[PDB]
Structures are given as C-alpha cells and as structure tokens.
RNA sequence: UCCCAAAAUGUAACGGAGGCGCCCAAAGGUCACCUCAAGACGGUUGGAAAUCGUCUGUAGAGCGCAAAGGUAGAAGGUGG
RNA sequence: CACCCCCGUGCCCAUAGCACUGUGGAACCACCCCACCCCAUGCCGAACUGGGUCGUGAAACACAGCAGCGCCAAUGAUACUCGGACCGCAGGGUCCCGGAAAAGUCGGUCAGCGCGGGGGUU
C-alpha cells in the first residue's frame, strides 16, 4: 500500500495583476472553478480561465468573497 | 351541487364562532391530497399500474407516481423504482371527491365513530387517515382479495389550532368525544 | 470483444469520413447524423460499416 | 419561487452589446414597458397603460406596444432587447413585442 | 488514553499554550512550566496516583488529552520503509497550560496529591489557586 | 488608587510595579500605568463586583469598575487591565460569585457539594449597589439533586441574564 | 487530486493519503421550466429510515467516478 | 429635489437580514372571480395562464416603531514577524527597532444613493 504517488504541478494562479496594461487575448487568471469571476471586457475559457477581449488597464474588483471580478478599462 | 352549500356554511362560520375583520380571513380548504403507498408490496408492474386506474376511477384525474429517491435502506430500496401514488385536487374535481367521501365512504366503515379529535398541526391544517380501501362499491373484493388503503391530507388555512373546529364541524365531519 | 467502438461515417454520395464513434451500450443499431463533405451543404451521414 | 425573473435579468447581461433593456410588468392591468440604459442609472422612454387606454385591460397589449415605439422612435432608439419578466411569451405580453416593432 | 478514529500520522513544532484556562471546574490546579509531550502512560499514572490520595473522593478532571500519534520505527531496520505504526499516543503541553484540577479538598491535602503527581511527570510544574475570570 | 503618570503608546512601563490599563465608556478613554502591588492588593479584596476610584495627578477622581484583566501565561503576573466607566444608574452586566452555606446530605452522609458555575452574570440595575457575593443554602438537597438558576434568589432588583433552568450547584455522588 | 510546499509560481524523500488507462446517441447544442439536504408535529399495512402533508430550511445536498476548487440568478433536477 | 405616497427598474453590494409588531385599501399592488377554446399541468387554472367588477386587506407586499437574534465593530494590551544582536546539550528562549492580527470588551445599525412612470393637497 506504500503510496509513492503524486501529480505534476499545475501552474495555476493570478497571471496579469491590477494596473497592468494588457492586450486582447491575454490570459489574466488561472483557476479551477470561478474564484475570480468573468466581469466586463473579459471572457472565460472552457477551463474557467478568464481572459481579455479588449486592450487597456486592468480590473481590481473584490468585495464579494466568492464574488470577485476582473475587467478592462479602455 | 355543494358549492354554495359550502359557502352558506362558511358565512355562518363567520358569525357564531369569532368576528374576523375579513371574509378572506376565514378558514377555507386549499386542496385534498390522496397518497397511495404501493411500496408496502411493490409489484414489478402488476398491481402498481392498476391502483392508479382505481384511484383515477375515484376522481377523474390521472395519478402521478411519487417515485423513491436514493436513500437505499434495510428493506432493499433502489432509487428509481415507483413507491407511491399521489393525486392532489382542487375545486370542482375536489368537492365531488369530498362530498363522495362524506357521502358513502367515511360513514360506512364497519367500526366508525369519528376520527382523531383536535390534534393535527400547530397550524390549523389537517390530515385524514384511511384504514383500508374495502369501503368502496367501485371495486369487487373477489379479484384482489388483499386490497390496501390510502392516506388523505385536508389542506386548509388557519393561524390557530382551535380554529380547526370548523373545517370538519361545520362541513360534515364527526369527531370523537 | 469491446463495448464502445470506432465507426466510420459515409456521406450520402460524398466521401468525407469523420470517425468519432461512441458507445454500443444503448445505440444498439442506430447511427445517423449530419455534417458537410466537399459539397458545401450539411448532409445525412449513415455511420454503417 | 420567482427565481425566474432574476435569471432573465441576468441572462440578458447589463450591456456587453450596447443594446437597451425593455422591462414589462404584465402582472396586472398596470403594464409599464420601460426602456432602460443600464450603463447609467437612467430610464428613457416608458409607455404605461396606467392612464386608462380606454378600459382595455389585456387588449391594451398592442396599444402600449405602439405607444412605446412612438415614444422611443422620437428619441433615436432603434436597437432593442426585449427583457421579459417572470412572464412567459405567447399572448398578452407577446403582443407588446408584435406592436413595438410594427412601429419602432 | 487512545482515541477512537483518526487519520493516524503527524509531526512536530512548538509555541506557548493557546487555551489553558486556569481554574474552570475545580478549585485547585497544577500547571506545566515547560513544553513537552505527555504520554497516555503518564496521564493515567497521574490519575491512578491521585485517586489513591482521594479515595472515595471524586474531584478530578483531566483537561489534557493524548492526541498525537507518534511512531517508533521497527527495531532491526535501516531507514527505508515509511514509518512504523504508532506506539504510545501523546498530547502536547506548553507552559502555563493547566493540566490538573481538584476541587473540594484542603490545600495541603491537595498540594500533597499534586506533589505525588509531579514526581510522575517529565516536566517541572506549579501548584496554584484562584483570581482571574475570563468572560 | 493614586496614579503618577499615564504613558502614551508603547512606553517603558518599568517592571517597578507598573501595569498598563485603560478605562472607557461612551466618551473619554484614558491611559496606562497603574501599580502591581497596590492594584493586586486591591483587586483581590474588591473582586470585580465593586469599584475603587483612580486618579492621575490633579483633581480628576472618577468612578470605574474592573472588567477584563489580561496576564502572563507561562506566569501568573498581571500585564493589563480594562476598566469600564461607572454611570450611576443604568444597569451593568456585572458578574457575581456563587458561594455556599451549611452542610447538606452528602456533606454529612455521602458525596461532595459542587459549584457547577462559579460566577453568574446577573444584570443588577444598580449604580453603587452591587452584590459582592451570592449565598446559596444547600442543607436540603440529597445525592443526585441540583439547584438550577431559577431558584437562585437575586437581591434587590437584579434580573438574571442566564437561563432559568441551567444548573449552578449540584451535590454529586461519591467517587 | 490533497498535505508536506515555509500566504506568489516552483521544490526532494523506498514521506503521509487517494484515484485513472473510462464513460455519456444523451450525462452533448440550444430553448423553456422546477430547487436540494436534514429535523419537528400528523398521518393507509410503514413506522429509527418507505410515501404524503404542512413549518423550519447560504446549503448542512447534488454534480458518472478521487479529492480539491467552484457552484442558489446553477453547472444541480425535468421536458421540446 | 414644492411636501408626501404608490408601481417599475438600478447602485450598493446584512451598519441594509429575521422575529415581535402597528398602519394601508377600491388611487397603485395583491388575494378571491370563471375558463370549451390561445397556453398549461410527468396528477391538479397551486403555478405558468386567458377572460373580470364587486368582495376583502385577511394572506402577500409597502411603510413606520423597535436593538431580544443576527450583522458591523473600535482604543488598550497582546500573538506573531521583516531587519539587527544574542542564550541554552537540546526541547526551546531572550533583547533592540519598526510592521501588527484573531478573539474579546466600548460601542454601531433594524441602511444609503438614482432614474422613469401613477395618483394626491384642485
Ligand atoms: Mg507498494
Ligand atoms: Mg519548531
Ligand atoms: Mg514555541
Ligand atoms: Mg515565542
Ligand atoms: Mg480561549
Ligand atoms: Mg505555493
Ligand atoms: Mg514561499
Ligand atoms: Mg531538487
Ligand atoms: Mg512523513
Ligand atoms: Mg442550466
Ligand atoms: Mg417597490
Ligand atoms: Mg381612499
Ligand atoms: Mg385561483
Ligand atoms: Mg395585513
Ligand atoms: Mg405578516
Ligand atoms: Mg491597538
Ligand atoms: Mg530575527
Ligand atoms: Mg553549548
Ligand atoms: Mg527596522
Ligand atoms: Mg516589538
Ligand atoms: Mg477584532
Ligand atoms: Mg454587546
Ligand atoms: Mg422595518
Ligand atoms: Mg420618483
């Protein structure tokens, strides 16, 4: 039963951070479910990674615990 | 039929008992519910498709089957199997069943003197229990000799437990001394 | 052996295969869909073989 | 429960589109059928039945629809999104849409 | 002593005691002044000694409880398997945490039972009385 | 309870018998140093069910009640104390010790008396008037019996903030 | 998949736990509609637990399987 | 935004929520009202829903009172800790300098900001 098992690192985390200029198609956070939630200007991939539609300054919205959003300001 | 005879007894129910500000504050009946529980002996499709037919002959409504949910048990209870017939009913389809039960059903139990008095809910809502279905002329005993029963729930408004003494009293239901 | 299988699709007079077959568990003999070969139109795909 | 109306007031997002919202209230004989620029906390061109409509009650459908379309065509409003409410979409409330774009 | 279900393996770290409330329950108490592990062997030894001094008494709580599995490896072997099973459970005990607590006996008759209990325990300890009330 | 100085913020607070504290209510909220010896000689004899007036130098004597002390674990030396400003009228949720009187059965023939709750939190609508103690006569109850808070008599207009039914003393069987 | 892993990512051990080598002609697309555990009183053979009925009910359920995240405006339960 | 009050819909995103509770009535809203048909219930006009007043504000909703429940929550002192320098064989501990919780006590609140429409003092 000696159990030497484990699983390769998943480079999950917040990629682009607050006040970074971004581009269309940049991947802005990696997550399992929706810790951070889509928000305006921002799509969300099939694996729940949200990502930019438009270019510009980035996000910052976090009052709802379990209700936090990313966004893009032209 | 029995509609205004209902409503010519609720209006007197306004008077001799209390003094509500509103005729809409009065006790009144929502729906009559009928729940067969065919899982006491669940046939694989034998009687279970028939008991719906007899209950539907009682009412002119097609019963829905209240199927079991997960909750596997001591007496081997796989989830998806049917376990209980149910028929809720309101208005004209309902008062015919209610007058039919005050009529030839409830009075003609062999051992009968009224049902459990003044003990239903903390709310005024009420519930009748049937001993067996052998109190009908819509079925012949010779065929299904081992006939079962059913369970009725008489739904009603009321805020007070003592305000149940009208849904049965001034409607045609005896209750025990 | 096997349950689920691979199964080729063949166009109503086209060519284009598409070979994404699913279970033999419940589709005991059924296998028809629609998608376009080399003619532009989506057409009927009988997935016999 | 009523969870149905919040699912459609989310299902049509605020504006990821630039369109306009058109919230009805066909729960009475008191329909309001408003037009709302959600980007600003502002409402634009309402079309109440609330002052009569000659005593038509569910028949007012077409009248409140054409009253909305007249109130909004006067202001330069031609992109629509029909925000239902709790309500289905077949008869009384469907006619407000049939009349809103007969003359929008 | 032993607990009923768990997980069954652990580790080791230390800092001073989180919740050691002084005298709930009893009048008098004994209190650790050094960090340690303490064995269910040693807890029950203190129990069995203090019972004798307070024969039909019945004034003894044990606000301390063995909890941590600890795992001596098999006696022959080079390092290599994983861990041994547990032998002997232990509870951690940081200074100022209370461990012992009698009530309803004269000071000296409780102080003597605490002296006997403190010769059975692997740490220096103090005997105390009363004052502070939290909530 | 004379006070020499009231230090601001983290200061020396010499271990020359100096304890930090505050007193606070709706308006004023003052400052630190007290005195280990005079405080603790006074804190024992005045419990928490009674007051003593402190004053920083100058004429500012003012009522206060001890409320929550904070002391050195890994030790027994007090470090900090909280005072609440006395108001002279409105009720205050003062704690009160539960004592005992007499010899019960078990105390004569069997098991011991047990104070299952050492301190109740009666509201006591009393400015200066507080109950320093609360006596509970036990010469009545036998083995297995237990006095609940419903029959814990409360002196001179003082409502109970605890459950009527919660046990407070209980003679308990031997062993 | 989760600790370890030292609040970014990463990180060893014959360290501590547990799964995969598939499934689903619908468990998919969309459109529409329902909202779950659990307990208390009362109820036909069942009565600790079938089934109905009322009241409580950020959730104590469910999500094909392992866990972790996430989820009540649904991904959960149902039809075209 | 002249003052209220009601219907819809937003920002905020329990200091706004629950319970006890009082006001409201054909102006608005709501229940009751009848249904072969549009439409619809894995049974039932309970819901969707399609045709309407009276009747009632009972239920629900709106608005007030309210600090028993929740929710928010200081100051003080801590816990820990960046950097600096040390003690103990070790488990572990200390001193200087800044940063500094959690819980608790004082307390705070039964919200605040819009837009459009309806009827009022006629
Ligand atoms: Mg192995
Ligand atoms: Mg360590
Ligand atoms: Mg330590
Ligand atoms: Mg330390
Ligand atoms: Mg504590
Ligand atoms: Mg990391
Ligand atoms: Mg790190
Ligand atoms: Mg390496
Ligand atoms: Mg290890
Ligand atoms: Mg869905
Ligand atoms: Mg409103
Ligand atoms: Mg009027
Ligand atoms: Mg109706
Ligand atoms: Mg009312
Ligand atoms: Mg109410
Ligand atoms: Mg501070
Ligand atoms: Mg350092
Ligand atoms: Mg050395
Ligand atoms: Mg520094
Ligand atoms: Mg410091
Ligand atoms: Mg805090
Ligand atoms: Mg308080
Ligand atoms: Mg209010
Ligand atoms: Mg306005």
Structure description:
The structure is cut from a larger assembly and holds chains A (74 residues), B (177 residues), C (49 residues), D (104 residues), E (135 residues) and F (175 residues). Chain A has 74 residues and is mainly beta. Chain A is 0% helix and 28% strand. Chain A has strands at 13-14, 29-30, 42-44, 50-52, 57-58, 61-64, 67-69, 72-73. Chain A has a two-stranded antiparallel sheet. In chain A, strands 3-4 form a two-stranded antiparallel sheet. Chain A has a two-stranded antiparallel sheet with strand order 5-8. In chain B, 22% of the residues lie in helices and 16% in strands. Chain B has a five-stranded antiparallel β-sheet with strand order 2-3-1-5-4. The longest helix of chain B is centred in the middle third of the chain and has 14 residues, at 92-105. With 104 residues, chain D is mainly alpha-helical. In chain D, strands 1-2 form a two-stranded antiparallel sheet. With 175 residues, chain F is mostly beta strands. Chain F has a three-stranded mixed β-sheet, with helices on one face. Chain F has a two-stranded parallel sheet with strand order 1-3. The longest helix of chain F is centred in the first third of the chain and has 10 residues, at 36-45. The complex binds magnesium ion (24 copies). One magnesium ion binds next to loops of chain E. The site of one magnesium ion has 2 residues of chain E, from loops. The structure holds two RNA strands. The PDB classes it as antibiotic.
Give a quick precis of the structure:
It is classed as antibiotic. With 49 residues, chain C is mainly β. Chain C is built from no helices and three strands.
Main sheet summary of chain D: 2 strands, antiparallel
How would you write the strand order of the largest sheet of chain B?
A: 2-3-1-5-4
Q: Distance N terminus to C terminus of chain D?
A: 34 Å
- By DSSP, the count of extended strands of chain D is 2
Radius of gyration of chain B: 18 Å
Oligomer: part of a larger assembly
Write a concise keyword list for the protein shown above.
part of a larger assembly, 6 chains, B: 177 residues, alpha+beta, 22% helix, 16% strand, globular, C: 49 residues, mainly beta, three-stranded antiparallel β-sheet, binds magnesium ion, RNA-binding
